[PDB]
Design a protein around this nucleic acid. Structure first.
Ligand SMILES: [Mg+2]
Ligand SMILES: [Mg+2]
Ligand SMILES: [Mg+2]
Ligand SMILES: [Mg+2]
Ligand SMILES: [Mg+2]
Ligand SMILES: [Mg+2]
Ligand SMILES: [Mg+2]
Ligand SMILES: [Mg+2]
Ligand SMILES: [Mg+2]
Ligand SMILES: [Mg+2]
Ligand SMILES: [Mg+2]
Ligand SMILES: [Mg+2]
Ligand SMILES: [Mg+2]
Ligand SMILES: [Mg+2]
Ligand SMILES: [Mg+2]
Ligand SMILES: [Mg+2]
Ligand SMILES: [Mg+2]
Ligand SMILES: [Mg+2]
Ligand SMILES: [Mg+2]
Ligand SMILES: [Mg+2]
Ligand SMILES: [Mg+2]
Ligand SMILES: [Mg+2]
Lengths: 77, 149
RNA sequence: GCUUGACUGCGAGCGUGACGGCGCGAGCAGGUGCGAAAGCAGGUCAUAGUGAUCCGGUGGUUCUGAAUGGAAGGGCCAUC
RNA sequence: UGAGCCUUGAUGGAAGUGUGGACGCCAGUCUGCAUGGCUUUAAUGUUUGAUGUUCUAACGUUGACCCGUAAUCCGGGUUGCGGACAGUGUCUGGUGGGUAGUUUGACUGGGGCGGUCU
RNA sequence: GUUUAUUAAAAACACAGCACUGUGCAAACACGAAAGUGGACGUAUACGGUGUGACGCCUGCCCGGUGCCGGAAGGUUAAUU
RNA sequence: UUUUGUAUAAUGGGUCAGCGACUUAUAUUCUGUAGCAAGGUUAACCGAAUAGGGGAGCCGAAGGGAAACCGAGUCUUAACUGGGCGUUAAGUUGCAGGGUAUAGACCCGAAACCCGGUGAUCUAGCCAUGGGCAGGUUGAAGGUUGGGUAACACUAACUGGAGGACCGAACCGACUAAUGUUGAAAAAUUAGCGGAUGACUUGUGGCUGGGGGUGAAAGGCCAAUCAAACCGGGAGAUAGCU
RNA sequence: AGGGUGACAGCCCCGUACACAAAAAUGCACAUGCUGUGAGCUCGAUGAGUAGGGCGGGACACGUGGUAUCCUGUCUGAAUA
RNA sequence: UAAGGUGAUAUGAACCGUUAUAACCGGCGAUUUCCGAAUGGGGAAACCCAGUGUGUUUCGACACACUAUCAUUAACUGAAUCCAUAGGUUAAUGAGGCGAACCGGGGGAACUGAAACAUCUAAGUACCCCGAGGAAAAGAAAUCAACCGAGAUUCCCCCAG
């Protein structure tokens, strides 16, 4: 699917709009890098496709506070 | 990313100490392993007195060695037999070990550490002012006198 | 020789254009210059020497300015 | 190794007798290692960028095992290798008939050529 | 040998041979938004692309222009600050 | 019909019958007409529904200036002159018609463009698995022996049987001529012709999809279609032309 | 009203206004039973990778324009009645 | 409900009813082959092959029934690795696929008009795709106003071409 998984950040669509204002359909893909996360509490080195910034959240909230929803949200993981 | 160090952590770690760092260092090493932890308030606030548990909880409660300066000082006439030695010298060896537990009958037992005698007290009879060394700062007022039989 | 009329505001009424425009103009008002004065001067003896609009630039202005005071911006005049 | 900030030097506890540097009105010398009675540049910390090193712990492995599993996929683990490189996302200079949409004037003794266009 | 089924069978294409050029393997390159796959269960005596076209004798001079290769010290130069 | 001009040998019509083209909506402006008149009229909606209510609002009774502003004046200007535009204009709301605007805008008609699907039962490659090739000829490499040599070369018989080899049916192809050309046939028939153990030919099924495939390269082939297939849609594309 | 009956019918026929009709099955208003919901009051608390921001785009009638406001892919990042 | 009936081309035959369920009409059920999401596996749809059980049986087995996948949950199992997960089994529920328009969302043309054509227009239209209900969406101000105030959203007419 190519989603942020943690922020659901999917690839949006826009226009290149180069010089001369020439319109050209495109799309803005997120970041994602599938990071190795150590929940520790669960003693499991869980992994999942995240995305920069959207990953800065996993740190500000907590691998747990994050997985809080996610899993609860139904997301596999 | 600040997090609280949990050990050596080279040029920054100080144990139970929190300092700045990089997210690349944390959530990749400083943490996943056992060397830090996020500074989400609780990590500090829920531990504000954690350091006071000793610098307070375990600091003022300690006054046993101190109370000696007054208690081990309120003794009535302190003197220890040092066995005379023909008007002058002595026969026995009265120094620290003695003026640091000469109270066995009173049950007020102690150690030979609490003593006030830099050097061995020559075999004389002078006012053996061997206070309690048990406490550093506030020592005590323990004496004794060279006696004999 | 002396000067700056190659001035500013307007203009009876005409010529020429499909139109946008282009041209001629006595006289009026303010101030100028030449002449004793009558007067002449609103560029060159005349007919070529040139680009609409838009979009912006520059100086001016108490015209406007989205709650009010300002300001950006807009208009008006000059001009690129 | 430049960039700066902090602190410490040179302009603006007693001589005299060996031995460094710092440019030079040199008719200069100033400043350091044995003996004798607040502007310009330099170090240390320091934070910041730049080269280039080594490390592992992200990240890669289409090396070797193990388990799912009587599976040359996939997933988790062990180890080896590589390593903040590679790669990807946003932005950004170049290149880009590979692809795409279009333009490429009128007069004219037919059209073109030539010439013309106020 | 092949070719315009249905006006062209040829002097056209292909060919064996030749030369240049790329590619060290997760190859170059190609299909694909990706995963994956062909190349190849191959590995430079190999694979792709280009031009020439058995074989014999040969294959001269020009690097100014265009392109490709190598250098990049210096001039100019993007986002960024 | 189209033309400067047609009996024109310039277009269209074999004939008949039925069908076949300036409409419709909202707006705007005129003209006729009706109502009311410095006033005219409501919209939605309510509704004892074509009534009645509702005057939100629209137009008109004042214009000038770029405007602030001013006002039968107002701008222009220092101008308190002149000049421009205004002031001694009846408007408004229905109804019918003329014209315009927006829409398919009288009707019919492209060659194309874009989107989503259907097609490799024809054909082009390729994949897997089966089949076919009467007869006749040529005689390579290798070899056994005789000779030959220091030994090898070398050589001669016989043996052996190669080859995008030779002749020629089936089979595959398509060089020539005739005939056919409203055919027997939307590419054939007849007489010749080329390849015929190979880059051969063929059955069965499979994979490549449209700006894509495939191609021993002709723009050839991709279902009698190809300089971008076919079907449905955008769509009544647009058509200063007929 | 309308329809039929051997030509056009209020009175031939079926209907027609009108008046009534449901074992059952359900739409929906209410009405209440059970399960779930939890009112009500006192004292609280009052929505952070968020608002803003830089870069690329998109939405607003508004084509970056002097251009607010809204969403953002990408990098950041606050006050806290 | 009622004297007529066995739908039609369809007569005929053979019949059922003339008071009270003959036929016919509406309610509610019983049955309901095979294909088809198609669901036991497979497959050129309407056919082919299996497992485990049974009503039975003369007990050959005749058929019939249950067995897809995923999600949540519960129980029982249970690897690399002590634990622990992953994986597995079972049961329970729920989904699955049809659909005319309307609606929310994801992606999104060109012809065309500009008398050419890029910006611009056609148009967020055609079209494809996911989802939902009888409505969907939206909705109780970090909204407007303008120093007076109004008071969520939605639809209508004005504002105004
Ligand atoms: Mg002249
Ligand atoms: Mg082109
Ligand atoms: Mg076009
Ligand atoms: Mg011409
Ligand atoms: Mg030949
Ligand atoms: Mg031909
Ligand atoms: Mg031929
Ligand atoms: Mg050639
Ligand atoms: Mg040649
Ligand atoms: Mg040559
Ligand atoms: Mg003619
Ligand atoms: Mg004729
Ligand atoms: Mg007729
Ligand atoms: Mg042959
Ligand atoms: Mg032959
Ligand atoms: Mg023949
Ligand atoms: Mg075939
Ligand atoms: Mg064809
Ligand atoms: Mg259209
Ligand atoms: Mg089945
Ligand atoms: Mg099935
Ligand atoms: Mg056009």
């Amino acid at each position: 699917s190519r989603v942020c998984q943690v922020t659901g950040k999917r690839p949006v669509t826009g226009n290149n709009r180069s010089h001369a204002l020439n319109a050209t359909k495109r799309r803005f893909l997120p970041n994602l890098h599938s990071h190795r996360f150590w929940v520790e509490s669960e003693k499991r080195f869980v992994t999942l496709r995240v995305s920069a910034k959207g990953m800065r959240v996993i740190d500000k909230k907590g691998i747990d506070t994050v997985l809080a929803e996610l899993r609860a949200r139904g997301e596999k993981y | 990313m600040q997090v609280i160090l949990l050990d050596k952590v080279a040029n920054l770690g100080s144990l139970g100490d929190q300092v700045n760092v990089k997210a690349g260092y944390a959530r990749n090493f400083l943490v996943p392993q056992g060397k830090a932890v996020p500074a989400t308030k609780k990590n500090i606030e829920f531990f504000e007195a954690r350091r006071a548990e000793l610098e307070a909880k375990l600091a003022e409660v300690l006054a046993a060695a101190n109370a000696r300066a007054e208690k081990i000082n309120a003794l009535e006439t302190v003197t220890i037999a040092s066995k005379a030695g023909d008007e002058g010298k002595l026969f026995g060896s009265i120094g620290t070990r003695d003026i640091a537990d000469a109270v066995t009958a009173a049950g007020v037992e102690v150690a030979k550490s609490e003593v006030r005698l830099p050097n061995g007290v020559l075999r004389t009879t002078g006012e053996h002012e061997v206070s309690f060394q048990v406490h550093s700062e506030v020592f005590a007022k323990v004496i004794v006198n060279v006696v004999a039989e």
